Amino acid sequence: AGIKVFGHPASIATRRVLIALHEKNLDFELVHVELKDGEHKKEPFLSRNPFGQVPAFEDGDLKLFESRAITQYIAHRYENQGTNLLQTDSKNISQYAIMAIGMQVEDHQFDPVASKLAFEQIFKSIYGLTTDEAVVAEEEAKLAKVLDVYEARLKEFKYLAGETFTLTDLHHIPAIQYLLGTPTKKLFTERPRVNEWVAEITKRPASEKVQ
Amino acid sequence: AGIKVFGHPASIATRRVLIALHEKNLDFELVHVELKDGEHKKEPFLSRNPFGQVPAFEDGDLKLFESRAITQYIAHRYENQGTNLLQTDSKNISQYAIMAIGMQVEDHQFDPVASKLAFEQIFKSIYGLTTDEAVVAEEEAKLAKVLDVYEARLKEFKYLAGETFTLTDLHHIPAIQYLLGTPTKKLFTERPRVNEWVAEITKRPASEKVQ
Amino acid sequence: GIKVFGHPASIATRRVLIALHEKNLDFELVHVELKDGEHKKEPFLSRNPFGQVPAFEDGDLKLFESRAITQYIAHRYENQGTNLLQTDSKNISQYAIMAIGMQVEDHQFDPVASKLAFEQIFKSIYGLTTDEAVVAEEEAKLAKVLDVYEARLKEFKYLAGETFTLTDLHHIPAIQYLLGTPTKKLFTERPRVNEWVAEITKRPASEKVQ
Amino acid sequence: GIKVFGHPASIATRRVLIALHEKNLDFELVHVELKDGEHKKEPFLSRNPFGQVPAFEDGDLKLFESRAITQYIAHRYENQGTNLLQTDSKNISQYAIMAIGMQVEDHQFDPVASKLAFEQIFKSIYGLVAEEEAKLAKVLDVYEARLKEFKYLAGETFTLTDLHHIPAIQYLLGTPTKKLFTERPRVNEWVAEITKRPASEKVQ
Amino acid sequence: AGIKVFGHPASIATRRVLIALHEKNLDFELVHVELKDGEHKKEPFLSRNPFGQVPAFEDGDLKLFESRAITQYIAHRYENQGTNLLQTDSKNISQYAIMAIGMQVEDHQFDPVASKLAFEQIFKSIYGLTTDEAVVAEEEAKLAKVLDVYEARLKEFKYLAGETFTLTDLHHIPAIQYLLGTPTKKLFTERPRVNEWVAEITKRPASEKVQ
Amino acid sequence: AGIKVFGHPASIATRRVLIALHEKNLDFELVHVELKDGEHKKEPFLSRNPFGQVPAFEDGDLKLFESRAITQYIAHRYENQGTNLLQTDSKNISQYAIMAIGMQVEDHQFDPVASKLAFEQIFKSIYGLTTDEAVVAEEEAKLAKVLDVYEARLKEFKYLAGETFTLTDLHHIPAIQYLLGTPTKKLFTERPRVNEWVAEITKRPASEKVQ
């Protein structure tokens, strides 16, 4: 009964779902999945997601996985509550397509690079691993290209999909929160519109709740 | 100025768009982008997609890129013509979410593996390279797990998102067409429901048109 | 009093925690948030300029390096709780034999056990697929170390002699993790090593940190 | 006659093809289907037991290894078409100078150019570099210094030393690694000269 | 009978033991283990150290291996002879712990780095192998961080464990002797207290004996 | 002497040149280039070889590098002294091509494998380093395939290029000398013609001179 999220509060993909729920002021339960004990690779979690990845999700009888399918579900199902995470006119098909391009770009261009950069610079340090400075330089060069495109985009519009905050922006937040604690931060601060966009989206109450 | 697709007829992502257009019986122009001459990495193509990847797309004044954003746009904008590529009740939000899970899974689990297997076994030959049999074995093991999940899913429903053919199924077609010309074919034929599903979706007139 | 600055999941931190519990000492565990890089910032760097958990405090005495901290606990609080030194702690040859084993844990066991844990547990957190070649290479190394331990444990009940000491204790946290992986088989296929693992992991101080 | 058993896209096969065209020789290209593992089966293994394209035939003479084949072509058909040896081919010191360059192409250039051309052509196209470019830059700095002193790498004329680079360079010119060539004025001229040759354009 | 060291006079770990024996003015025999013939990886050396590393050690019936266990044994067993290698008040437990921190740091932070640097720059050169300049640059950056810490430490105290020379200092000597014959030398000379410390500990008669 | 070799006596490539000079009974000077002091990476060595590798070579005013270009030069320039290192009829172009195939095969197929096997089993073991048994097994499998080809070849002819000893055989000698001091020896002894060939070429006076 009600809304449940099956994940881990440090997980980027889990936080993506958590932020959207808070944006909608929805009540939910966070059911912790213990990644260190391989709980995500065992039953009964595998019955919620056979690919063994956090998060999984429940709204009454509806069972979901994949963070970006979950956020979009939340944005449609609870459209008329809290922050609107869709475009202002959500029935406008061309406007939706524009938001969708950005969501695809976050997934394909931004997320894999931002992840490697977080792994090399934060998570390797945890254990006993030295950060490979060549990977860092190569990935930062890739991230810089992505952010150059974003800079051009944000000269034209207040947010990535148009004049309002949407899922396109929201999906970037968790990876950005981690990158802000690394020297990769400079890539954001050296680009004026990107920098303002990062400051706006990370200062939101829903973003701060999961941090 | 009607519908234009800027891509290459051999490209998997381009074919994804082409199949959807044909499913809708839409008229369009395919404008050839010459990948061999790096036309995708030059202006004016970069003004249609700053990431330098085929396909880009145009419908009148609307300019898009990312194959799966384009197909979705087609499925909504031209919903009431040709094959319905959305769920039967397209305003059902839970049902949309279920289709979206499958589209995410195709993108994250299927496509990277099916693409490597096509590169190693088909497209390395184009450049005079030999196929690395270790990569082939490794990627086939991954593909087998994905297809085991699909097999279980297709015991329960006729197609991956439910009773009816949708974008979830369509998105797999181009990679599958290529994999059918390789020994990786056995992974599909080994699995009775998967095999039927492949035979159904590849025999469709829209699928055969791009082949 | 006694403070430990670390993280309860950390192998090195657990090494110190187990020794404190073995001595029935009261202490405060002050959490250092590794995910936020707290270990690479001040004020933690003023306790350990190498940016590694754990650091440690006993009144005015400030320490780091888990195995230096354990030793000290064993000496400073020798006459309370479990004796973590040799039975006759003033016997110099007997101390040297314990010290060989502590050096071997550090050089031969720990780096290998740590790679095996990273590949098989901690990569799975994050997105990453375990490199099966590293796992096979490291397991071959670990097998050689454990063959030496097996021979040793045919002669003596524990690694330094007839009693449980720091030499055994220092292995416990890495072993607790490796027991949750298929590397477990390397322990179970060696009868004396298997018994030794079961004995040291079942200790109340070991179970406390798990 | 002359037969080449290989694949037209293959760098090593193209090396042989260019030398044959330079000599205006007639030959048959017999396609070996790498995708079906034809190179790892009989009867190709009876032409090269190492299972690599190209293999080669001139009448009864059976060869493999591209750089042995090109050199054979340069000697056997010396007085026809382009001279691929040094001008005075009986000058032993001059030959040795050409041979140094042929070794350098094989050891220093080819492994690096090969990784690069392939990592990138394929990133650009099917969605699958800094270390190798740094290595290539060193090799090209040496070539730049060399080409300040002489028109081509072995001296004043085009030889096997230059020819052996062509196929890898043709691929690298379709990638951003092109900048390493254009950054270096003498290298850039050399690349333009050797890639514009009719024999080079024939295999492209 | 008596004290025997089973090792090789060029070995770093062997020299560690030799320096401590000379500091105590002890008589001993060095029994040569021929590394070039793999004598360390054969019986009977394996019966003295099953890990196949020099040195092994004997004091009457007591059989040892691991250089730092051997040096500590020497420092305790023969405490009241020659140079005191322990702290001035050797029964002071906190003072011992401070020496032990430094010994742990030498082992974990200094030695693996110094050792890679010596292998790359000196030992590969003996056999005509080429030094990997990337490893050298990477490891020097690490060594610089360790030596910055040592510099700060040596501003406060004359030696690393306090006011007197101890095992903490001694354990560094052999690696340093080798690194002084390489360009890595500059890392010691550019740090004024480190440089003084190096000059003091390498000019000791026991240090010069093994050089 | 008119002839100088700038190298290191342990270096496989240097020894290749040395053996050829001794085969011709030529007088020469070996100048030992000090790798430990980075002499190979400094002027004036870099004027002999801008790639900073041993050997370089001088015959009067002629300056060369690359071992196999040097040996070939020696074989031509001093053809009618000492051992003939070319084919019996050195002007026979097809016969030269057959020798050239073998020299290419040594370079590409034999040398990189034999080198790794020597590094893993000889160079590393001397120091502290554990020989990676997976690399050894992988490389031995490759070497076995090469030696199977050689076995078939040596059933047909006395040496690898035909009836007489040539550069094709000579170029293998230094790597083989090292591999004979390792368990990889078995790969040579288990193949009867290969074994006879190894015994013949390693027992030559010129081969023994550099050992």
Ligand SMILES: O=c1c(O)c(-c2ccc(O)c(O)c2)oc2cc(O)cc(O)c12
């Ligand atoms: O219910 C949903 C929905 O109606 C649409 C939608 C509507 C108009 C469009 O133009 C469009 O592209 C998508 O998207 C979704 C996307 C998801 O990921 C999940 C959903 O539950 C919906």
Ligand SMILES: O=c1c(O)c(-c2ccc(O)c(O)c2)oc2cc(O)cc(O)c12
């Ligand atoms: O106080 C300590 C001490 O006395 C000894 C010691 C005693 C006898 C021996 O034979 C020996 O090898 C070591 O070790 C220590 C090691 C530490 O890290 C911390 C300590 O406080 C002590």
Ligand SMILES: O=c1c(O)c(-c2ccc(O)c(O)c2)oc2cc(O)cc(O)c12
């Ligand atoms: O002087 C040389 C020479 O004449 C030839 C040559 C001659 C006839 C042939 O058929 C052939 O293939 C090569 O090769 C060489 C190869 C070198 O590396 C160095 C040289 O100095 C010569």
